[PDB]
Design a protein around this ligand. Structure first.
Ligand SMILES: [Mg+2]
Ligand SMILES: [Mg+2]
Ligand SMILES: [Mg+2]
Ligand SMILES: [Mg+2]
Ligand SMILES: [Mg+2]
Ligand SMILES: [Mg+2]
Ligand SMILES: [Mg+2]
Ligand SMILES: [Mg+2]
Ligand SMILES: [Mg+2]
Ligand SMILES: [Mg+2]
Ligand SMILES: [Mg+2]
Ligand SMILES: [Mg+2]
Ligand SMILES: [Mg+2]
Ligand SMILES: [Mg+2]
Ligand SMILES: [Mg+2]
Ligand SMILES: [Mg+2]
Ligand SMILES: [Mg+2]
Ligand SMILES: [Mg+2]
Ligand SMILES: [Mg+2]
Ligand SMILES: [Mg+2]
Ligand SMILES: [Mg+2]
Ligand SMILES: [Mg+2]
Ligand SMILES: [Mg+2]
Ligand SMILES: [Mg+2]
Ligand SMILES: [Mg+2]
Ligand SMILES: [Mg+2]
Ligand SMILES: [Mg+2]
Ligand SMILES: [Mg+2]
Ligand SMILES: [Mg+2]
Ligand SMILES: [Mg+2]
Ligand SMILES: [Mg+2]
Ligand SMILES: [Mg+2]
Ligand SMILES: [Mg+2]
Ligand SMILES: [Mg+2]
Ligand SMILES: [Mg+2]
Ligand SMILES: [Mg+2]
Ligand SMILES: [Mg+2]
Ligand SMILES: [Mg+2]
Ligand SMILES: [Mg+2]
Ligand SMILES: [Mg+2]
Ligand SMILES: [Mg+2]
Ligand SMILES: [Mg+2]
Ligand SMILES: [Mg+2]
Ligand SMILES: [Mg+2]
Ligand SMILES: [Mg+2]
Ligand SMILES: [Mg+2]
Ligand SMILES: [Mg+2]
Ligand SMILES: [Mg+2]
Ligand SMILES: [Mg+2]
Ligand SMILES: [Mg+2]
Ligand SMILES: [Mg+2]
Ligand SMILES: [Mg+2]
Ligand SMILES: [Mg+2]
Ligand SMILES: [Mg+2]
Ligand SMILES: [Mg+2]
Ligand SMILES: [Mg+2]
Ligand SMILES: [Mg+2]
Ligand SMILES: [Mg+2]
Ligand SMILES: [Mg+2]
Ligand SMILES: [Mg+2]
Ligand SMILES: [Mg+2]
Ligand SMILES: [Mg+2]
Ligand SMILES: [Mg+2]
Ligand SMILES: [Mg+2]
Ligand SMILES: [Mg+2]
Ligand SMILES: [Mg+2]
Ligand SMILES: [Mg+2]
Ligand SMILES: [Mg+2]
Ligand SMILES: [Mg+2]
Ligand SMILES: [Mg+2]
Ligand SMILES: [Mg+2]
Ligand SMILES: [Mg+2]
Ligand SMILES: [Mg+2]
Ligand SMILES: [Mg+2]
Ligand SMILES: [Mg+2]
Ligand SMILES: [Mg+2]
Ligand SMILES: [Mg+2]
Ligand SMILES: [Mg+2]
Ligand SMILES: [Mg+2]
Ligand SMILES: [Mg+2]
Ligand SMILES: [Mg+2]
Ligand SMILES: [Mg+2]
Ligand SMILES: [Mg+2]
Ligand SMILES: [Mg+2]
Ligand SMILES: [Mg+2]
Ligand SMILES: [Mg+2]
Ligand SMILES: [Mg+2]
Ligand SMILES: [Mg+2]
Ligand SMILES: [Mg+2]
Ligand SMILES: [Mg+2]
Ligand SMILES: [Mg+2]
Ligand SMILES: [Mg+2]
Ligand SMILES: [Mg+2]
Ligand SMILES: [Mg+2]
Ligand SMILES: [Mg+2]
Ligand SMILES: [Mg+2]
Ligand SMILES: [Mg+2]
Ligand SMILES: [Mg+2]
Ligand SMILES: [Mg+2]
Ligand SMILES: [Mg+2]
Ligand SMILES: [Mg+2]
Ligand SMILES: [Mg+2]
Ligand SMILES: [Mg+2]
Ligand SMILES: [Mg+2]
Ligand SMILES: [Mg+2]
Ligand SMILES: [Mg+2]
Ligand SMILES: [Mg+2]
Ligand SMILES: [Mg+2]
Ligand SMILES: [Mg+2]
Ligand SMILES: [Mg+2]
Ligand SMILES: [Mg+2]
Ligand SMILES: [Mg+2]
Ligand SMILES: [Mg+2]
Ligand SMILES: [Mg+2]
Ligand SMILES: [Mg+2]
Ligand SMILES: [Mg+2]
Ligand SMILES: [Mg+2]
Ligand SMILES: [Mg+2]
Ligand SMILES: [Mg+2]
Ligand SMILES: [Mg+2]
Ligand SMILES: [Mg+2]
Ligand SMILES: [Mg+2]
Ligand SMILES: [Mg+2]
Ligand SMILES: [Mg+2]
Ligand SMILES: [Mg+2]
Ligand SMILES: [Mg+2]
Ligand SMILES: [Mg+2]
Ligand SMILES: [Mg+2]
Ligand SMILES: [Mg+2]
Ligand SMILES: [Mg+2]
Ligand SMILES: [Mg+2]
Ligand SMILES: [Mg+2]
Ligand SMILES: [Mg+2]
Ligand SMILES: [Mg+2]
Ligand SMILES: [Mg+2]
Ligand SMILES: [Mg+2]
Ligand SMILES: [Mg+2]
Ligand SMILES: [Mg+2]
Ligand SMILES: [Mg+2]
Ligand SMILES: [Mg+2]
Ligand SMILES: [Mg+2]
Ligand SMILES: [Mg+2]
Ligand SMILES: [Mg+2]
Ligand SMILES: [Mg+2]
Ligand SMILES: [Mg+2]
Ligand SMILES: [Mg+2]
Ligand SMILES: [Mg+2]
Ligand SMILES: [Mg+2]
Ligand SMILES: [Mg+2]
Ligand SMILES: [Mg+2]
Ligand SMILES: [Mg+2]
Ligand SMILES: [Mg+2]
Ligand SMILES: [Mg+2]
Lengths: 55, 120, 114, 211, 122
RNA sequence: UGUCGGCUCAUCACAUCCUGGGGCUGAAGCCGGUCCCAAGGGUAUGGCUGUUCGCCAUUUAAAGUGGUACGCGAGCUGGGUUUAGAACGUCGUGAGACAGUUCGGUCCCUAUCUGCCGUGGACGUUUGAGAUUUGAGAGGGGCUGCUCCUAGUACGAGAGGACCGGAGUGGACGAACCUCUGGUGUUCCGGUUGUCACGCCAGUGGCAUUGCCGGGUAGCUAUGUUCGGAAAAGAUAACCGCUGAAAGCAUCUAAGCGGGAAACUUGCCUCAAGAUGAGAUCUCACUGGGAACUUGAUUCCCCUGAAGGGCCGUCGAAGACUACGACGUUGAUAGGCUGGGUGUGUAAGCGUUGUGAGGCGUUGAGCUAACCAGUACUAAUUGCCCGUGAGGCUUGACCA
RNA sequence: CUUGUCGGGUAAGUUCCGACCUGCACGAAUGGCGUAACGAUGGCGGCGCUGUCUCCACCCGAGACUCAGUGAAAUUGAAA
RNA sequence: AGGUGGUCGGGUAGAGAAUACCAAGGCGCUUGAGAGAACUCGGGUGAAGGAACUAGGCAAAAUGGCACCGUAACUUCGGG
RNA sequence: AACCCACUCCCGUUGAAAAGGUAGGGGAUGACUUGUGGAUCGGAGUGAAAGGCUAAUCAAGCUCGGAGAUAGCUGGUUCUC
RNA sequence: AGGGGAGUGAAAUAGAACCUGAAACCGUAUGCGUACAAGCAGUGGGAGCCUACUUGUUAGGUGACUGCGUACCUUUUGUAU
């Protein structure tokens, strides 16, 4: 099936009112000061104040 | 429904699923630290942890049982000789899983599986 | 399911001797035909079992008058008055459902000497 | 009716009478309930008593809800329920136990049933499927017609379609109490009780009974 | 459970070897007949000099089924084949001797005659 | 604007088929005939035929009559009709034709709007928040047989046989549940065929539909288990009245007072204050300055952001995504680990016996998913973001 | 006309098989009547077998569903 | 996922160039990760019944090899 | 079996495909299948005959001309008082 | 890749897809309106708010509430159809 009348500008923009994106949970590593995702290893290799992967 | 059901299909057949977790456990006992997807990392601890418990008692019966589950001669040698002696007094929980981010290619959540008391 | 185990365990006071599938047992069954009670007898070969505590059951099979009949007994019910093993059979399986297809000399079960 | 207890479904079992019959039984554990508030006509309109049961860690009870549980020296428990009583007296801090029931004593059990996520019309509404052979095209478990032509030319409200076999609340009426264990706080009930194991159930006297 | 077009045999000496259910009696839209339930049959195979002939429509009672009958303690009794007893117009058996075992659910006020004639009752 | 019949799913009328209440009877009883009131709930399976229909066979309390594009093909079918092939009978010189037969013959569409079934996001409800609630309104449900007692009584020449009133057990339908009886259980345990590999023997693994099979835990499930329809109240329909005149009588009606049905309003179950008419109860939190004015429900600056909510993480008999529920070290939320349980059915190695296949012992052995109980070994941080600073005015009454 | 009438088969058979003859409107090389073997040919009936069905239940893979990347179609006077 | 002439063609089972597992050799098919709803597609197993389904046993289930024994009407003497 | 064919079901129908696929199916030493080269054609060819085939076109191919055929038939026909 | 400066030029919003550079279509910013309201979306009436300035018998933007109101073409005896 297909539309009988084309949708308007307002009709299609009302449908997109639920398309806004969310923001993640970012924490600051207390020892150094790097910003990482919450509950994730730092981009440097730190988690909860400990080297874990040494790059 | 799937009330009180255990396991993950992971879009693979049973033979594929069983064969993939043998490779991961065999690689883990050799490198001590691997990077995989988070859902796969959580299904691996139900395979690689019962193998370390089995190696705490060394006998012909146990090594044959371990070789039937990890068909790798080096992994049976690594167990019974390095692990199981290192973890001789650990009441379970021999591996640690840490979220590390998402892959560039498809945005899949990744993880770091490692052994708890690595020599590093 | 920890306080279920205690409600059921205080009704588990019978003797229930040890027996296994393939054995020939005789079951004494309480029977009514009005006001007078009596103990009927069921004799057959055990083909199945179920070890679930109070919810245990077993199945025996007999040929009555040319017709085979199977009865499933609740072990801890007051109906099952007593049970005695008449002969010990030697089988490799746990459920002898294949015996339903065999009739005469084909359905013999080797006796367990010791 | 009008006064009962809140318990937890423990599971099903059986008990054997002396005469050999077996009674299918659902075990219900009723830890003693604590009267939290008494509602009267001159304060609230209707008339009822409010009840709490269980145990709650102090870090999960909020400040507003803790001062409510402290007006009556009751201590916080999981959940709060209200029983609309007819003509009864209960002071704040009282105890309500299984000891208000006897054997015989038809009772009504209210619970929240198991949830089947999103069900089709065969499972939900007991429809009957079309052919599995004889030429049917990809239309085996589908509903079929859902209306008529130009007249109405719309689907009537309340039509039976698919979706969410509920985890809703239901009551099973006229269930017989087989045994009441005062010391172990148990309530053995003949029949089946809605919900899964470990869920909250409300047990009240039979609404109808009569015969 | 017995429904229409189930082939069940005969536990009498009336003349039939093989009857077939054509109606389950005692209710609108009734589906199955258990042990002790009245059905309407037709005779598919007979004996040359018996007292029923092939193609006869008549009533019967189910006395033996593979599905079985439960008891109050939870037990079940199952047989290896479905059997029936043919009846005349007064709900009374036609044959004079009864083969095989029967059960105690026939001990009603209207079927005690076939309980007496049976070699064994379970 | 796709045309018969079947299937799935329905919705309304009453000119009622059954169940319910009555008047008359050429109504003795058990049965009926006919008319009135009543739409709550029910209201066959098959053989033949493309059939609707019909006729048969066996049931049922009964197998209602109609409207809805003769309801329903962007829901299914394609047997019939109504394209192209071929044949028969009949008609025509012929091409061909026949509400005359016979065999064969492609059924497309990812749902924008209304509608309907579920489920969320925003805002409002006049400070905000945690929790419990009343009920305007709406929906679901409402069927019924047989046997026994009363009683072989009332009725009747006899045969035959009740009303009213009580007990029991079923059929169909619905809901919940998994203790029992079974089903399934490619995540558990065994047997076995062909072949390849692990150096080789033993022992195991891959592939062959899970290779083929025998069993089977949890969960899900019916064919398994339990429960339901009511009683009762109010106002009534037809109908039956009491008292009573207009109209000395009679008369249920004109004034007045009653009885009365599965229909109507409650009683039973569920949803329900977006019921903008946004209700009620308990408890909790917040008690700083300065400036500019277009001079009060005003605007800006600094300080202070509580009660609480969310993000995040471990998950769940909750689930399409959400939402909902439990928990986050002062922790048993998940995995492991330690015991038990359950299922399968006497592992491997070794020792004996035999020439070997095999048997026997160590040995109900070994293994054992989802189950029960305990235990911080592993993962639930050492955070961030929203949400503020006592809640306008007018009038009345009690305080001051 | 017509589901002709009689018989067989089935609890019940507008189809099938055997007959009768009233052949609307058979008929002898647009051949008549038979016929073993043959047929992805039409009709009817049995045995075995079964999820075709009563009446569906569970399980396994691929979609559908969520996320990251690429990215159509028929249709459309305008739409509170 | 179509069509395209000819040649070579190993081991173990096997009548075989069928079929199963492999060799020499070649490849994992140019979106992936999750979750584990209705419904659709391709399959596995089902209690009691066994064509009651339907225009119609459509589809599915079943049979299936080698040796030996045994085999009807009918027949164009071959057969069946 | 290879090879040639196309009887049934389902899927697909905006297809992987302007005629396929998976399961079953028929012939398979012959009136067989097939490669290369050659011959016959538009009122003409070829046809174990279906009005079938003659370059995804057939009760008379395609292409360019007569040609802007003809259309008592549909549609459309533009600024102001 | 593309940009921010700096240089050339009378002029780079003449910068190489380079004169002018419209409309459909897609954005950012400001003012007012909009979450108890039913329909060809306009018009008659009309409050409040915002801006400008000749400070309200003025100009511009918005339009709460309300009466009336079923597009255009064609073809027709007749179309919201
Ligand atoms: Mg339109
Ligand atoms: Mg239109
Ligand atoms: Mg916009
Ligand atoms: Mg969107
Ligand atoms: Mg779980
Ligand atoms: Mg496999
Ligand atoms: Mg669920
Ligand atoms: Mg059906
Ligand atoms: Mg069909
Ligand atoms: Mg199709
Ligand atoms: Mg299909
Ligand atoms: Mg409906
Ligand atoms: Mg007959
Ligand atoms: Mg109406
Ligand atoms: Mg009427
Ligand atoms: Mg009626
Ligand atoms: Mg009536
Ligand atoms: Mg009457
Ligand atoms: Mg009457
Ligand atoms: Mg009606
Ligand atoms: Mg009605
Ligand atoms: Mg009705
Ligand atoms: Mg009512
Ligand atoms: Mg009929
Ligand atoms: Mg037919
Ligand atoms: Mg009509
Ligand atoms: Mg009609
Ligand atoms: Mg119609
Ligand atoms: Mg109709
Ligand atoms: Mg339609
Ligand atoms: Mg269709
Ligand atoms: Mg149709
Ligand atoms: Mg349509
Ligand atoms: Mg269509
Ligand atoms: Mg469709
Ligand atoms: Mg067809
Ligand atoms: Mg047709
Ligand atoms: Mg033709
Ligand atoms: Mg002629
Ligand atoms: Mg054909
Ligand atoms: Mg036809
Ligand atoms: Mg269609
Ligand atoms: Mg939609
Ligand atoms: Mg539209
Ligand atoms: Mg619309
Ligand atoms: Mg109400
Ligand atoms: Mg409303
Ligand atoms: Mg109602
Ligand atoms: Mg209703
Ligand atoms: Mg008499
Ligand atoms: Mg039922
Ligand atoms: Mg069960
Ligand atoms: Mg169980
Ligand atoms: Mg069982
Ligand atoms: Mg079982
Ligand atoms: Mg099983
Ligand atoms: Mg089970
Ligand atoms: Mg080798
Ligand atoms: Mg070997
Ligand atoms: Mg092998
Ligand atoms: Mg291999
Ligand atoms: Mg298998
Ligand atoms: Mg096989
Ligand atoms: Mg159910
Ligand atoms: Mg008077
Ligand atoms: Mg009077
Ligand atoms: Mg009056
Ligand atoms: Mg009254
Ligand atoms: Mg009443
Ligand atoms: Mg009733
Ligand atoms: Mg009504
Ligand atoms: Mg509110
Ligand atoms: Mg409120
Ligand atoms: Mg806080
Ligand atoms: Mg909360
Ligand atoms: Mg979840
Ligand atoms: Mg364990
Ligand atoms: Mg065990
Ligand atoms: Mg051993
Ligand atoms: Mg083994
Ligand atoms: Mg041994
Ligand atoms: Mg021993
Ligand atoms: Mg502890
Ligand atoms: Mg005719
Ligand atoms: Mg005829
Ligand atoms: Mg005939
Ligand atoms: Mg037929
Ligand atoms: Mg004939
Ligand atoms: Mg001649
Ligand atoms: Mg001639
Ligand atoms: Mg001719
Ligand atoms: Mg002729
Ligand atoms: Mg001839
Ligand atoms: Mg002939
Ligand atoms: Mg041929
Ligand atoms: Mg038949
Ligand atoms: Mg699936
Ligand atoms: Mg996407
Ligand atoms: Mg080879
Ligand atoms: Mg091959
Ligand atoms: Mg190689
Ligand atoms: Mg994928
Ligand atoms: Mg399927
Ligand atoms: Mg199968
Ligand atoms: Mg199995
Ligand atoms: Mg079956
Ligand atoms: Mg069976
Ligand atoms: Mg059979
Ligand atoms: Mg039929
Ligand atoms: Mg039928
Ligand atoms: Mg077939
Ligand atoms: Mg098959
Ligand atoms: Mg070829
Ligand atoms: Mg051809
Ligand atoms: Mg064809
Ligand atoms: Mg074909
Ligand atoms: Mg197939
Ligand atoms: Mg072939
Ligand atoms: Mg093929
Ligand atoms: Mg041949
Ligand atoms: Mg040429
Ligand atoms: Mg030429
Ligand atoms: Mg030409
Ligand atoms: Mg022709
Ligand atoms: Mg030609
Ligand atoms: Mg062509
Ligand atoms: Mg021409
Ligand atoms: Mg030309
Ligand atoms: Mg022209
Ligand atoms: Mg000219
Ligand atoms: Mg015009
Ligand atoms: Mg102009
Ligand atoms: Mg410019
Ligand atoms: Mg340009
Ligand atoms: Mg110039
Ligand atoms: Mg330019
Ligand atoms: Mg522009
Ligand atoms: Mg804006
Ligand atoms: Mg309103
Ligand atoms: Mg408003
Ligand atoms: Mg509107
Ligand atoms: Mg409107
Ligand atoms: Mg206006
Ligand atoms: Mg104006
Ligand atoms: Mg103005
Ligand atoms: Mg207006
Ligand atoms: Mg208007
Ligand atoms: Mg026009
Ligand atoms: Mg016209
Ligand atoms: Mg006209
Ligand atoms: Mg209109
Ligand atoms: Mg229009
Ligand atoms: Mg008009």
């Amino acid at each position: 099936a297909v539309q009988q009348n084309k949708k308007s500008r307002s009709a299609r923009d009302m449908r997109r009112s639920h398309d806004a994106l969310e923001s993640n949970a970012l924490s600051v590593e207390k020892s150094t000061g790097e910003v990482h995702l919450r509950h994730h290893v730092s981009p440097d290799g730190f988690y909860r104040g400990r080297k874990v992967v040494d790059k | 429904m799937r009330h009180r059901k255990s396991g993950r299909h992971l879009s693979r057949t049973s033979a594929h699923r069983k064969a993939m977790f043998q490779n991961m456990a065999v690689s883990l006992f050799e490198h001590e630290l691997i990077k995989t997807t988070l859902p796969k990392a959580k299904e691996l601890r139900r395979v690689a942890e019962p193998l370390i418990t089995l190696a705490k008692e060394d006998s012909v019966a146990n090594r044959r049982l371990a070789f039937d589950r990890t068909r790798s001669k080096a992994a049976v040698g690594k167990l019974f000789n390095d692990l199981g002696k290192r973890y001789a007094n650990r009441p379970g929980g021999y591996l640690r899983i840490l979220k590390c981010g998402f892959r560039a290619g498809d945005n899949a959540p990744m993880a770091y599986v490692e052994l708890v008391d690595r020599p590093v | 399911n920890k306080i279920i185990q205690q409600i059921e365990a205080e009704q588990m006071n019978k003797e229930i001797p040890a027996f296994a599938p393939g054995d020939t047992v005789i079951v004494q069954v309480k029977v009514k035909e009005g006001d007078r009670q009596r103990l009927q007898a069921f004799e057959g070969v055990v083909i199945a079992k179920r070890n679930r505590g109070l919810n245990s059951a077993f199945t025996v099979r007999k040929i009555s008058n040319g017709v085979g009949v199977e009865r499933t007994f609740q072990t801890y019910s007051p109906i099952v008055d007593s049970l005695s093993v008449k002969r010990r059979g030697d089988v490799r399986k746990a459920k002898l459902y294949y015996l339903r297809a065999l009739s005469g000399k084909a359905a013999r079960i080797k006796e367990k000497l010791v | 009716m009008t006064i009962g207890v809140v318990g937890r479904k423990c599971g099903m079992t059986r008990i054997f009478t002396e005469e050999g019959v077996s009674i299918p039984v659902t075990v219900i554990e009723v830890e003693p309930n604590r009267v939290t508030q008494f509602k009267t006509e001159e304060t609230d309109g209707y008339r009822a008593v409010q009840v709490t049961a269980g145990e709650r860690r102090a870090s999960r009870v909020t400040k507003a809800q803790a001062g409510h549980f402290a007006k009556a020296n009751v201590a916080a428990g999981r959940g709060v329920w209200e029983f609309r009583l007819g003509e009864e007296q209960y002071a704040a801090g009282d105890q309500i136990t299984v000891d208000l029931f006897q054997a015989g004593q038809m009772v009504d059990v209210t619970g929240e049933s198991k949830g089947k996520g999103f069900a089709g019309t065969i499972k939900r509404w007991n429809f009957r499927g079309q052919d599995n052979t004889h030429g049917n095209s990809v239309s085996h478990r589908v509903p079929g017609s859902i209306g008529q032509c130009q007249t109405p030319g719309r689907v009537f409200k309340g039509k039976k379609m698919s979706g969410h076999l509920g985890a809703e609340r239901v009551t099973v009426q006229s269930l017989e109490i087989v045994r009441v264990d005062a010391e172990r706080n148990l309530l053995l009930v003949k029949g089946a009780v809605p919900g899964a194991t470990g869920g909250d159930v409300i047990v009240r006297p039979a609404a109808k009974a009569r015969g | 459970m017995i429904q229409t077009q189930s082939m069940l045999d005969v536990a009498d000496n009336s003349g039939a070897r093989r009857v077939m259910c054509i109606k389950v009696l005692g209710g609108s839209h009734r589906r199955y007949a258990g042990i002790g339930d009245i059905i309407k049959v037709t005779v598919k195979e007979a004996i040359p000099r018996g007292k029923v002939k092939k193609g006869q429509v008549m009533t019967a009672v189910v006395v033996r089924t593979k599905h079985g009958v439960r008891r109050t303690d939870g037990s079940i009794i199952r047989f290896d084949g479905n059997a029936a007893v043919l009846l005349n117009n007064k709900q009374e058996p036609i044959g004079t001797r009864i083969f095989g075992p029967v059960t105690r659910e026939l001990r009603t006020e209207k079927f005690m005659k076939i309980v007496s004639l049976a070699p064994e009752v379970l």
